[PDB]
Design a protein around this ligand. Structure first.
Ligand SMILES: *[C@@H]1O[C@H](CO)[C@@H](O)[C@H](O)[C@H]1NC(C)=O
Lengths: 51, 51
């Protein structure tokens, strides 16, 4: 994930600290997290999307 | 403002080339991209028309 080729805009990782802790929480969503996530067999509408 | 996208190698200096536009784009870095150092590679492109 080194620089010079990797692209990120802003606000992808948060910082949290109370007393000299500086703990980092995860915010990146996986592929199976957004809505309308289908699979290899798909029959949306009249089309039957195969592989 | 440098628009002369000719690194002493293009075939634009011909009588059959015609009209075109000296453009340029960006590339990738890495062993598969053609270099050995993570850095944006200057990739030039030239298009024209023929008859
Ligand atoms: C999922 O599909 C439905 C129906 O096409 C649509 O209304 C909805 O906005 C979609 N969800 C996303 C996150 O795009």
């Amino acid at each position: 994930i080194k620089k010079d080729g990797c692209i990120w805009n802003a606000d992808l990782v948060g910082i949290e600290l109370r007393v000299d802790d500086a703990v980092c929480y995860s915010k990146i969503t996986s592929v199976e997290a957004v809505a309308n996530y289908s699979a290899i067999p798909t029959t949306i509408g009249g089309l039957r999307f195969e592989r | 403002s440098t628009s002369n996208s000719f690194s002493d190698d293009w075939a634009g200096k011909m009588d059959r080339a015609g009209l075109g536009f000296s453009g340029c784009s960006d590339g990738c870095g890495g062993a598969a991209c053609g270099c050995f150092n993570a850095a944006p590679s200057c990739i030039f492109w030239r298009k024209w028309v023929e008859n």
